[PDB]
Each structure stands twice: as structure tokens, then as C-alpha cells.
Design a protein around this nucleic acid. Structure first.
Ligand code: GTP
Ligand code: MG
Ligand code: MG
Ligand code: MG
Ligand code: MG
Ligand code: MG
Ligand code: MG
Ligand code: MG
Ligand code: MG
Ligand code: MG
Ligand code: MG
Ligand code: MG
Ligand code: MG
Ligand code: MG
Ligand code: MG
Ligand code: MG
Ligand code: MG
Ligand code: MG
Ligand code: MG
Ligand code: MG
Lengths: 26, 191, 139, 97, 189, 117, 176, 45, 41
RNA sequence: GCUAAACCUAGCCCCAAACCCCACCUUACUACCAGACAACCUUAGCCAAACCAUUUACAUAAAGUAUAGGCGAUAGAAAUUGAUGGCGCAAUAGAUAUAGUACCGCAAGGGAAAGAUGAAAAACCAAGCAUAAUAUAGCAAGGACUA
RNA sequence: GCUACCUAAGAACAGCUAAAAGAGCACACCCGUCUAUGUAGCAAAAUAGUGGGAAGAUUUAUAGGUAGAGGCGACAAACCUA
RNA sequence: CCUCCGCAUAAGCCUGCGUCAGAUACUGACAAUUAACAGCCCAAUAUCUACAAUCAACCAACAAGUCAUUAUUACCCUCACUGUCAACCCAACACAGGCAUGCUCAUAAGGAAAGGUUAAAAAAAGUAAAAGGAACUCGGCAAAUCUUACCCC
């Protein structure tokens, strides 16, 4: 594990974006 | 036991325990607060009350105590449901299985007030060590054969045949059995 | 006795005597056909055949005609998860032939649940005609 | 794949614990206390670098000089070798000469 | 094993009410609880039945574990997993009434209910496979409830099906029943 | 080439295999011609008692009182064995009371121990 | 007879065999030396029978009936041995003042480690014994460096253990 | 042709790399001491 | 590993996003994608 | 959607303080016979001097001073003065270490890898491919184009 | 524990010709002249055929010895654990 | 159909195709190799021990050779311990290699060159070949035959 939070936060936001694109909300 | 062995509901030496914790596992150790043996106040059979989770408030009886992980198992309480005997064809039967509870999540119950109580290990002149409830006083009591053909009778077991004497078992048995030895043990060299 | 220093004997010395025997033996079923008068034992490795003869004749009053011994090597091939060899202990095997024509044969040793059984009897396996439809509903 | 798929556990820092709250106190012990104690005397740590600073070679030399006799055998051998290597590097290698 | 499995039910019904004297059992129930009413039971039993079936409809296993026994929950849920059931109670033809009661100690009460309900069971894919969503059907049943005697309660334990029970509603899909899968050496008889 | 396996009499040439034993205590000696002379006095003689009439079965009844453990001590033995006679003859040469100046001359010398078990 | 190597024929095959409690040290301390001598062989016969049962159970691939009685017998024999050894030690201390039955001495071996050399029994004096003279009980100066290195290795291990213990204690205190 | 240089023989093994030989000379004693310090399970051969 | 890079995923993506429409491994492998993207720019 | 991906703690780093039953030298781990045989003894070299040959380091301050030195690379005093944890690592990191084990070598000796569920188990993302082989021409892209 | 040499005490050498042979032909055995194959091979030096020696300065099992400013060497700067 | 072999001892290895049960010659459990064969020896002090072996008889030798006791004193009153398995060892391997000795001299023992098909080239091994017979080639290399006379070292 690499210590840090900001890279993980960015990756979480990008994962949310990808999830939304794959499953667009009504 | 292997270092940092994860104590579980199954006893530390059962087949299920060996299956769940084979010798090669290196799971993260479980952090347990260090309750001293002189501070542990929950004992098997004690009536307790659940403070958190499903069935909170209900009072049951401690069935098992996994002291190594600060656990008390309340019989028939804090129960999920699991299948037993489920084979390739049969669905199995649903059984209520208790889940362990922390002593911080469980509190003892007054013998008569039937309410949760905080406890102190106050010495009493008669009961040198015994529990005492703090909010309402009163002491919570600590809860709880035919001889076979190969078992000594109590009287025989307690008979004191030992007459203290300055004789070793060897020479005493020699005298008792009549063995006679005249040869003298020649001195040997120790080094 | 085992794991004990034997007093050194010098010529003309007293007889060596053991009062609380430390040897424990096991009477085992032979793995192969043996004569009717032969008894097989597993013995501590430090026990001689003379010691076994005296042991049997004094503690059990068994008339012993002959004794033979062999050190069976335990397999060291097995390995644990760490690739370290697991040693099966070596052990001594003693064959004792009884005297006075006496015969010995190994004796024939070894000659919730209710609810589970009741439910299994009450399985009521699915009917093919039902076609997977649940049976609890009575409509 | 070198990026974790979950947010790290939240890190809570108590900005007002005793250490942080009283940090810096008595740093002016000298000027505010008739110079009875030098602020460098407030430094707790290795004996050979209490109120002293230097590069790696100087630090190693000071360590060997001050606690070398009390060092372990292999640690002292390592310190001697490090001193030798640092001497060679600083006195024979570099852009500027 | 010092600890033992603490069962909350029994394997099966004590004595079966063979469908078309128990005051000792009622006495035991009352000496254990002290506030029970056989006359008042039928309404409570009907409410438990309706609530449990609505819990089946909504996949409310947590509430099922309170409204039915552990000998009932598998029977109700195993075959309905992965499919949607649209169950609805419309009315009760004749009033529910206790029939038979028998008794570490459990008490079983058999209640005869002749009511009217609806079914519509769909597949994983939402395809109707049993019953009609609107047509109501008359159902006569014998629900055996059970209780455990500190925190126990009355829960459905079993449903006795009369041997003379009318055949259930036919299934929509046709079925194939394979015959003997004979090996080469075997011959059909 | 195997260093981690225990050295036993099953490993090595004929001489090694013959020479190494398995811990069994010697019973005699070897004379000319590899003839083994077995000494009877070196053979441990099991002094087995007569168990007839013995009333102590291997197991104890569970209905037996529990008593505190009191490891016997030299002081306790002296009090229970020698102290009575010492007091009697004080009211009214320690060898008479039991002390033996030297273990030498005995069949069972306490130190250096010269008996089995 | 060989029948004493097996349990009672009626007990043969029984799933569970009931047995009393293992002899306690306090209970044995009241028994005479002859009584302990006889009880030793009673327990020895029981132990032989139980070991026979265990081996036959392994051979038959079946559980041993009541496996706890083997542990009970072992505990009883250990208690009896402890009582006998306590009596012998008390007598030896009274009569000689020696706390050890076997002569020995603190000696420095060839590797510089202080060991407790247990004397062996010999017929010839040590100054004439060839093998004993070959055995060396002194460490030459070249061993001092290795003694220091071993001491420092032990110190490092101990320091690591203590530091880890303090770290774990601090983490526990913070958590609770 | 090569590779089979180890023609095993326990007599040679023990007489060349044994405990007695290692303790015979001070150098071998230091070899054993080094093995002990490193923690080798097999000090001698 | 006092200081380590935790953004390398995004650093690689900043280049690969402009190479997603290439042919072959140039649209997947950074070592090749970076060269092709520099040439494309 | 497969291979897989991640993870937090096992421990470790630097400091402070504080000084730390039996068997076995014979073929070690071998119950049991006339010994005699017992240890001190300058480091060297690499390297620098751009070769190499004399030579080349192993509290503060005085001081890089006096001195030494193919007086050159460099070496270098004394008198005298007074002397309570972590802006550490977190499984390719930190000890080599889950272990001096496995394995390798006759031997000295060399020397690894790794684990991750849960309160309870008595409950989407690398490469590589596949979905989905391919169309004339070409550093595989750019300008573009309706394409 | 390979290999060079040596030490101790051992073992092997069919058959034929000749006759007390560092004799001839030729097995086992030792070696490796020439060719082919192989060249990440069966093999980190082998296989097949062919060939030299094969009662001697022979071959070989066992234990021991000589250790690197060294050993050993029927000198090929050979060999001393690929 | 093959038989290089094979069976034992030595050395080496150390349970490594015995039974049962499981998986996907592997795993777990159980059992086993029984001393007569072999190893493991010798009470002292002096004192003896010129004359090989080779069928040891002639002969024949040179390299000159493994085999021997007596005198006195002690001393019997006692058969332990250890190896015993295997398809096996050294070569990273179920490696066409290395591996001492006794018998078997082709075996009574031990084994299988072909997974199935087709019968392309190239390649390897082998057999046969009209007429010629080294014209090949650096060279009769290889193969086939059994074959003289020389020279250099
Ligand atoms: N710097 C440093 N301080 C330490 C170390 N170990 C302990 N301490 C300090 O020692 C003090 C006392 O430690 P505690 O464990 O609280 O108490 P203790 O057991 O009485 O301490 P000790 O007497 O040092 O063993 C605290 O201030 C710790 O931070 C260490 O390794 N380094
Ligand atoms: Mg034997
Ligand atoms: Mg060799
Ligand atoms: Mg230079
Ligand atoms: Mg330079
Ligand atoms: Mg000074
Ligand atoms: Mg690591
Ligand atoms: Mg991909
Ligand atoms: Mg010949
Ligand atoms: Mg010749
Ligand atoms: Mg030359
Ligand atoms: Mg040359
Ligand atoms: Mg190889
Ligand atoms: Mg084949
Ligand atoms: Mg083929
Ligand atoms: Mg032709
Ligand atoms: Mg020509
Ligand atoms: Mg011609
Ligand atoms: Mg031409
Ligand atoms: Mg030719």
C-alpha cells in the first residue's frame, strides 16, 4: 500500500465517472 | 498454537478449527483490549443483557466464553440462521446460530432487580473475592457418580499409609519384599 | 528404565535393580501372518530383548520362550507446507514366542441428530409434475 | 493497478494533544531565563548530535568518536567502512574540485 | 462440546390433526404464559399468516424469521428464491378457529383456515408460471403454529395438507418426465 | 549429502552400521572371537511387587475431597521423622537419630545416586 | 497374562468407557513408599492397555473409546513420579545437602559457552581417561570475538522484542 | 563426462567435514562458531 | 519508500487517452503510445 | 469476462534508557578403561599520489595551527579550555528472515519466495487474451472527410 | 568423494598361438584413432560404427596423504570438484 | 519380438509402484525389514616367527613375496546391541552417461523398438545395383575388400 489519499480520491472519482458512463442514470 | 492464531467460535482444536485456520494462514491479528483476569466479570451461566445490535435489551444466559477474544455467547440470543446438513440434494434444516458479543456490548444483570448493572470486584471479609453491583449494591453470585471397577474408593484414596522415614523407595521396597543384597557397590569415578 | 543414568557396574558389584519401570509397551496386531505362538509388541527404542523378556515375565507372568527385535524406520519423506520433512518416529518391534505351547491370537477389538433424521425423512422431494413451482402455497 | 481501489481509512489528527499544544515551550529558555540553560540543551536524541549538525561524513566521524567504543561489532565495522567510503567520495569525487 | 445448538423449534408436528380433550395442553400453555386465550388465538394466527405471506411477497426474510419457525422458513423460501411471488389475501370465507393443541417445551396449535387468496409466480425473467394476478382462489388449510417456552412467540410451524385435498392449480408449462436411462447391457421392460 | 536427517545406525557402511547403537544400555562385554559375555548383574532386574490384595485402582473416585498441594520439603521430612525423637531425647551422635555421615557403604547411595529411578 | 494388555471383554467395542479421576500429587503424598511402588505397576499395566487400545484404534481407523483415560493415567504416573522424586530429593538434601542427584560442574566448553557438564561414571581416573582428555573444557582467545557477536545478536533480538511490545501497547492504548 | 564429482562415501564425509575434524583445529572451531552465529541448523556435516 | 508516486495511473492515462484510436499495441502500451502520441502531436 | 487487480499488519529501522530427565569433542548429540598434545608471534592489499617504488586518514576550542611529508599526494598533535520517542518503512519497502528455513555447493559458504473475507465460517482498473481474424499502400499518424 | 602423484592392504584379466615374453590374435575391462549423428543434444563432451591396449610402466574398489608465494606433473604451462 | 542383460554382496540413498481411502510413480492413514548372514572383539609382561605364490610335485626364476608361537601370571559364574524394505546410487530429470565384486555366458531371470494414419520433399541409419572401378577427393574420407612395395620422424 502506498501512503496517500489524494491519488486514491482521484481514482475513486474516475471510477464513479466510469460507472456512470457504463450504467447511465435514468 | 500458531503465532497470532485467530481464535474463533469453534474450539481451538476441532476439525472445523483446523479447516478454517490451517497452519499456513497469516491473517491480520484481531485487536482485543487487554482485560486482566482480575477484571473479567462475565462467567459461563451468568445472566446478561444485550446492549447493541439485534435483540438489544433482551436478557439471556452466557453459554460460552472465548476469553482470548473478549467474547461471551448468549444462548439463543444474537442469532443469525444457518443451514446444517445441506447436501447436494437436500436443502438442509435452518438452525439459529448465536454470534459472539463483546463484554463492552454485554452487561451483567442483577439477581433480583433484573436490570443491567455495573460491577466491581470488591473484597468481602467472607467472600474474599466476589462481584458487587455499583448502582444498587448487592452481590451477584457466581453461577455453576458411581465408582467403576477401576476407581479407588474414597476411603482407600484418602488412607494415609505414609509413615515418614529416612528411607528411599528403593531400600524400603527391598525390605518389604525381602530382597537381600550383600555385594557392596564399588566406588566409581565421576567426571 | 529410559532417560536415566544406569549405575556403573564393576566386577563383584550388586545386582542392577529397577523398581519403577519407565518402559511402556504396546501389544499390536501383526501386519502379516504370524505363528500362533507369536505376539507382536511396539517397544521403546532403549529396551533390549532381555529387558522385554524380564518385563513380560515379571509384570505379566507371561511365559516367554523367545524374543526378537527389529528397529523399524519411520518415513521421513512427508513434507509440511514449508517443504520441511516431517519425520515419522522410528520404533522398535519385538516378536515374542510364548513357551509351553501356549497360543495367542489378537482379540477382536471393536466388534439434534433426531431432528435432522426426521427432517430428512420429511424431505418430500420435488414432484416432477410441479415443474419447479414451490409447494408451500396451497392455491 | 498501482492505485488502491478504496479510499484509505480516514486519518484523524488531534491538533490539540499535549505534544502539539505545548510544542515550542521553553525554546526561549536562555533569553527568558538569564541564560542559565542553552536551548540546545532541550534537544533529546543521540548523544553525538545533541546541538550539533554536519554532513554524513562529519556525523559518522562524530558517532565513531563519541560512542564508537560502545557500538556493536558489526555496526562499528559498518561505521568504519562508511567513514572510509565517504572520505573517498567527498575528497576525490564530484563535479567541482 | 460444552456449548450445544440451541434449537428454537421442533422437527415436526407433535400429533397430526387428521382432518375430516386437549384442555390439558391448554392448561400447560396457560401455566407457562398466564395470559393466553384459545378463543382469541384465531385472529392472531390469521394475522401472523397474512404478515408472513406478505413478507414472502416482499422478500422480507428478517420478518419471516420472526413470523415463522426455522422448520418453516426453508420450506417457504427455498423454492421461491430467484423468483417473484405476488401473493395477496382478499377475504376469509369462514372465521378462523382453533382445532387441535398439543404440547425445552413447545406448544403447537393447529388452526383451520378456509380463506380466499391469489397467486402469481414469475420466473427469473418475469414470465408468469403459476396462478393469475387477479383471479381469487378458495384455499382450505391447517396451519400448525408453535411457541417456545422466555422471548419466544407464536410462529407458523407447518401446514398439514389433507390426503383428500383437491389437486392444486395446474402448471402453465408442459413437463417431460424421462424414462429409464438404460445402459447398453440393459433392456426396457 | 543429507545433513538435516538424524545420524542413525541405518546410515553408513557395514562398520558404521554395526558400531552405532540405538541407546540401549550395555548388558556385557565382548571377548576374543566376538563372543558376547552377558553379565547378569548388568541386566536390570524389574523388582515387581505382589499386587494381590492391593486396593488402589489406577483411577480415583470423582467423589473425593480436594486438598491443597503441599510439595514435601526437607524441613517437613525432618519435622515428621527426626524432630519427635530429637525432642524426646532432648527432654530425656546424630547417627542414632538417623543422620548418616557418608553415603559410602550403602547399597543405595543418595549422592552420587547409584540406583535406577 | 496377555489379556492384561486389553480392556475388559465386556468393555470391548463400547463407545465410551467411564473412568475416575487421575491420582493427584496431594493424594499420592499420603501413600507409603510400598503403596506407591505397587500403584506404579498398576498404572503401568493400565497405560500399556490404553496404548494398545490407541494403536488398535489407529489400525482399525476408528476413534479410541474414551481417549481421556490415557491422559489421566499419564498424569497419575507423572504425579507418582513427582512424589517419589520429592521424597528422594528431601532425603538427599537432609543427608548430603546436594540439590542434584547427578554430580556436575559449571564448565566453559571449547566454544566459550558456560555449560553444566554432567559427570559420567568411569572406572579410571580423569587424568588417565584418554577420551575425556581429548574433550576440551577451555575456550581459546579466538572465541572472544564470537562470544561478543553472539551477545550482540541476543541484545538485538531482545531490543527488537521490547520495542515491538511498546509499539503494540501504544497502539492498543490509542485504540482503547 | 563431468558433473558426477560427488562419489558419496560416509567415511570420507565424516572424516573430512565432521564435528571431530572441525574441532580438531582452531580454524574449524571458528567455522563451527560462524555456523552457530549465523544460526545454521547443521553446524557440521 | 519514503516518497512514492501515486498518480502514475493518471500520468499514463493523460497520454493513452490520445492513443486510444491508434492501431496495435501503440494504443495500450505506454512505452509505445507515448512515442506515437508525440509523433502525432 | 478470464487472467487478474488492489488492501493492513506481520513485523522491521534509528535512537533513549538500561549492562547482558537423557545424549553430545569417537563418525557430536554415542552409558562404562593407563592420559600426556595442548594457546600468545608486526596484518596485508586494494586505493591516492592521475604510473609506481618512500608515503596514503581508520563534547567544543586551540586547529586544520605547531609539525611530518618522493617537503607531494597527503598525514597531523599537545600545552590549554571545559563537558524521552520518530516531518522512520509498510510485504519488490523495512532485518536476508514466515528463515538462516527451503534450495544450491564435498566444504567453507551462498541463500529465497510469500499473507490479505468477515462481528461471527458453530453465517470497474496493467500487460495478455475473449467477446469480435482479415481487404490494395507502406514508422501506421496527421490534414481531413459525409464516409 | 573429480583429477595429478603417492601410502596401506585388496580384486580383475575368457579363449587361441606361443612359452617364464613391458610377446601376437582376441573377450570382459581400460582408452579414445577416424567417420557419421548430435550441437538448448540421451549427454554442460554423448550415441553408432571403426579403432589402440588388453599379464602389465595394466585396470580398478576401499581408507589415508601432498592445498594455492602451494600441491602434483612419463612438461600438455597438464590436473587440483564442470 | 529383445535380451545390452539378470540375481545377489559391497558402496550409496533412506521408505521412494505393499494395503486402504481420496483426489486431481500424487496426497493421508495403516502395515513392514525378526539372526544363524554381516558389523560390533581380544588381560598382561617378555619371548618366538631365514626357507614365497604359481594344482607345489618336477623345472623355472626375479620384481624376492599376506597368512606360524612359546614361557609365566590372571581368567567363566552369563548368546546382548546394530544393518536387513524398495522399481533405489552419482549426473539439476523415469538422463541413450558413470558405477566395484560373485554366479548365470544366454538365461529358469529381466524386458518392449511401433499413440493412430499416410508413405511428400529435405535429413539420419541400412540393404541392393547394369557397364566402369578412385576417373571422386586436400587425402581411398566413408564404404566395400583383406590387400604389395617403399620413404620421413
Ligand atoms: N526514545 C525512546 N524512549 C523509549 C524507548 N522505550 C521506552 N521509552 C520511553 O520510556 C518511558 C517509559 O516507558 P514506559 O513503557 O511507559 O514505562 P516503563 O516500562 O517504566 O519504562 P522503562 O523503565 O524504560 O522500561 C517513556 O517516556 C517511553 O517513551 C525507546 O526505545 N526509545
Ligand atoms: Mg537384528
Ligand atoms: Mg572414485
Ligand atoms: Mg596510484
Ligand atoms: Mg583516477
Ligand atoms: Mg588536549
Ligand atoms: Mg522482504
Ligand atoms: Mg486489459
Ligand atoms: Mg589371457
Ligand atoms: Mg602384450
Ligand atoms: Mg612443451
Ligand atoms: Mg606453450
Ligand atoms: Mg547433467
Ligand atoms: Mg514403445
Ligand atoms: Mg508416430
Ligand atoms: Mg555398381
Ligand atoms: Mg584423382
Ligand atoms: Mg588402384
Ligand atoms: Mg578432379
Ligand atoms: Mg576407412
Amino acid at each position: 500500500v502506498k501512503k496517500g489519499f489524494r491519488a486514491a480520491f482521484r481514482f475513486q472519482k474516475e471510477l464513479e465517472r466510469q460507472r456512470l458512463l457504463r450504467c447511465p442514470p435514468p | 498454537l500458531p503465532p497470532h492464531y485467530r481464535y474463533g467460535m469453534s474450539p481451538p482444536g476441532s476439525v472445523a478449527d483446523k479447516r478454517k485456520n490451517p497452519p499456513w494462514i497469516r491473517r491480520r491479528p484481531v485487536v482485543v483490549e487487554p482485560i486482566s483476569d482480575e477484571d473479567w466479570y462475565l462467567f459461563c451461566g451468568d445472566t446478561v443483557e444485550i446492549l447493541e445490535g439485534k435483540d438489544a435489551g433482551k436478557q439471556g444466559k452466557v453459554v460460552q466464553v472465548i476469553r482470548q477474544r473478549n467474547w461471551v455467547v448468549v444462548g439463543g440470543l444474537n442469532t443469525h440462521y444457518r443451514y446444517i446438513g445441506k447436501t447436494m440434494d437436500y436443502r438442509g434444516t435452518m438452525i439459529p446460530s448465536e454470534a459472539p458479543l463483546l463484554h463492552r456490548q454485554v452487561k451483567l444483570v442483577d439477581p433480583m432487580d433484573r436490570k443491567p448493572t455495573e460491577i466491581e470486584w470488591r473484597f468481602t471479609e467472607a467472600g474474599e473475592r466476589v462481584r458487587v453491583s455499583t448502582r444498587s449494591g448487592r452481590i451477584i453470585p457466581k453461577p455453576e457418580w458411581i465408582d467403576g471397577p477401576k476407581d479407588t474408593s474414597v476411603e482407600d484414596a484418602l488412607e494415609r499409609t505414609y509413615v515418614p522415614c529416612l528411607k528411599t523407595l528403593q531400600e524400603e521396597v527391598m525390605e518389604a519384599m525381602g530382597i537381600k543384597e550383600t555385594r557392596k557397590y564399588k566406588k566409581v569415578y565421576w567426571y | 528404565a529410559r532417560n536415566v543414568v544406569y549405575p556403573l557396574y564393576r566386577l563383584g558389584g550388586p545386582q542392577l535393580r529397577v523398581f519403577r519401570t519407565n518402559f511402556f509397551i504396546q501389544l499390536v496386531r501383526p501386519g502379516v501372518a504370524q505363528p500362533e505362538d507369536t505376539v507382536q509388541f511396539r517397544i521403546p527404542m532403549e529396551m533390549t530383548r532381555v529387558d522385554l523378556r524380564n518385563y513380560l515375565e515379571g509384570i505379566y507372568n507371561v511365559p516367554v520362550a523367545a524374543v526378537r527385535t527389529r528397529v523399524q524406520h519411520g518415513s521421513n519423506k512427508r513434507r509440511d507446507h514449508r517443504n520441511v520433512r516431517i519425520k515419522k518416529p522410528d520404533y522398535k518391534v519385538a516378536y515374542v514366542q510364548l513357551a509351553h505351547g501356549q497360543t495367542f491370537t489378537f482379540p477382536d477389538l471393536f466388534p439434534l441428530y433426531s431432528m435432522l433424521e426426521e427432517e430428512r425423512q420429511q424431505r418430500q422431494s420435488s414432484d416432477p409434475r410441479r415443474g419447479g413451482v414451490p409447494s408451500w402455497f396451497g392455491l | 493497478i498501482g492505485i488502491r481501489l478504496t479510499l484509505p481509512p480516514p486519518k484523524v489528527v488531534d491538533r490539540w494533544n499535549e505534544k502539539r499544544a505545548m510544542f515550542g515551550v521553553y525554546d526561549n529558555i536562555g533569553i527568558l531565563g538569564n541564560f542559565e540553560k542553552h536551548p540546545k540543551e532541550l534537544i533529546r536524541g543521540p548523544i553525538w548530535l545533541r546541538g550539533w549538525k554536519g554532513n554524513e561524513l562529519q556525523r559518522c566521524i562524530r558517532k565513531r568518536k563519541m560512542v564508537g567504543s560502545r557500538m556493536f561489532a558489526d555496526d562499528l565495522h559498518n561505521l568504519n567502512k562508511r567513514i572510509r567510503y565517504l572520505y573517498k567520495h567527498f575528497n576525490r569525487h564530484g563535479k567541482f574540485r | 462440546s460444552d456449548r450445544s445448538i440451541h434449537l428454537a423449534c421442533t422437527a415436526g408436528i407433535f400429533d397430526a390433526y387428521v382432518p375430516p380433550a386437549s384442555q390439558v395442553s391448554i392448561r400447560r400453555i396457560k401455566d407457562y404464559d398466564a395470559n393466553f386465550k384459545i378463543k382469541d388465538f384465531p385472529e392472531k394466527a390469521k394475522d401472523i399468516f397474512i404478515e408472513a405471506h406478505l413478507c414472502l411477497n416482499n422478500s422480507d426474510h428478517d420478518r419471516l424469521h420472526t413470523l415463522v419457525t426455522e422448520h418453516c422458513f426453508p420450506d417457504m423460501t427455498w423454492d421461491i428464491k430467484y423468483k417473484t411471488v405476488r401473493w395477496s389475501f382478499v377475504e376469509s370465507l369462514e372465521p378462523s378457529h382453533v382445532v387441535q393443541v398439543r404440547c425445552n417445551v413447545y406448544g403447537q396449535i393447529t388452526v383451520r383456515m378456509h380463506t380466499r387468496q391469489t397467486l402469481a409466480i414469475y420466473d427469473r425473467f418475469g414470465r408468469l408460471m403459476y396462478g393469475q394476478e387477479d383471479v381469487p382462489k378458495d384455499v382450505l388449510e391447517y396451519v400448525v403454529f408453535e411457541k417456545q417456552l422466555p422471548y419466544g412467540s407464536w410462529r407458523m410451524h407447518t401446514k398439514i395438507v389433507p390426503p383428500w385435498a383437491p389437486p392444486k392449480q395446474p402448471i402453465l408449462k408442459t413437463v417431460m418426465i424421462p424414462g429409464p436411462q438404460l445402459k447398453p447391457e440393459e433392456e426396457y421392460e | 549429502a543429507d545433513r538435516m536427517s538424524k545420524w542413525t545406525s541405518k546410515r553408513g557402511p557395514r562398520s558404521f552400521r554395526g558400531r552405532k547403537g540405538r541407546g540401549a544400555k550395555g548388558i556385557g562385554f565382548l571377548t576374543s572371537g566376538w563372543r558376547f559375555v552377558q553379565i547378569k548383574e548388568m541386566v536390570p532386574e524389574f523388582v515387581v511387587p505382589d499386587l494381590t490384595g492391593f486396593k488402589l485402582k489406577p483411577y480415583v473416585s470423582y467423589l473425593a475431597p480436594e486438598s491443597e498441594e503441599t510439595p514435601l520439603t526437607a524441613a517437613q521430612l525432618f519435622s515428621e521423622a527426626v524432630a519427635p525423637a530429637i525432642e524426646k531425647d532432648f527432654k530425656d551422635n546424630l547417627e542414632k537419630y538417623g543422620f548418616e555421615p557418608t553415603q559410602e557403604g550403602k547399597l543405595f547411595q543418595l549422592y552420587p545416586r547409584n540406583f535406577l529411578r | 497374562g496377555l489379556e492384561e494388555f486389553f480392556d475388559d471383554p465386556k468393555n470391548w467395542g463400547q463407545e465410551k468407557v467411564k473412568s475416575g479421576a487421575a491420582w493427584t500429587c496431594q493424594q499420592l503424598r499420603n501413600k507409603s513408599n510400598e503403596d506407591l511402588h505397587k500403584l506404579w505397576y498398576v498404572l503401568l499395566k493400565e497405560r500399556n492397555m490404553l496404548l494398545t487400545l490407541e494403536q488398535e484404534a489407529k489400525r482399525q481407523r476408528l476413534p479410541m473409546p474414551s481417549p481421556e483415560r490415557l491422559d489421566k493415567v499419564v498424569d497419575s504416573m507423572d504425579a507418582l513420579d513427582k512424589v517419589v522424586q520429592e521424597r528422594e530429593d528431601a532425603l538427599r538434601l537432609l543427608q548430603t545437602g546436594q540439590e542434584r542427584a547427578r554430580p556436575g560442574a559449571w564448565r566453559r566448553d571449547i566454544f566459550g559457552r558456560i555449560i553444566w557438564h554432567k559427570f559420567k561414571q568411569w572406572v579410571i581416573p580423569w587424568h588417565l581417561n584418554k577420551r575425556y582428555n581429548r574433550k576440551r573444557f577451555f575456550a581459546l582467545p579466538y572465541v572472544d570475538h564470537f562470544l561478543r557477536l553472539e551477545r550482540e545478536k541476543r541484545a538485538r533480538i531482545k531490543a527488537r522484542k521490547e520495542n515491538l511490545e511498546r509499539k503494540k501497547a501504544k497502539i492498543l492504548l490509542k485504540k482503547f | 563426462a563431468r558433473g558426477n564429482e560427488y562419489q558419496p562415501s560416509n567415511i570420507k564425509r565424516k572424516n573430512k567435514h565432521g564435528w571431530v575434524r572441525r574441532l580438531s583445529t582452531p580454524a574449524g572451531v571458528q567455522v563451527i562458531l560462524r555456523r552457530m552465529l549465523k544460526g545454521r541448523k547443521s553446524l557440521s556435516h | 519508500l519514503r516518497n512514492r508516486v501515486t498518480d502514475r495511473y493518471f500520468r499514463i492515462q493523460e497520454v493513452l487517452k490520445h492513443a486510444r484510436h491508434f492501431r496495435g499495441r501503440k494504443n495500450r502500451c505506454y512505452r509505445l503510445a507515448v512515442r506515437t502520441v508525440i509523433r502525432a502531436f
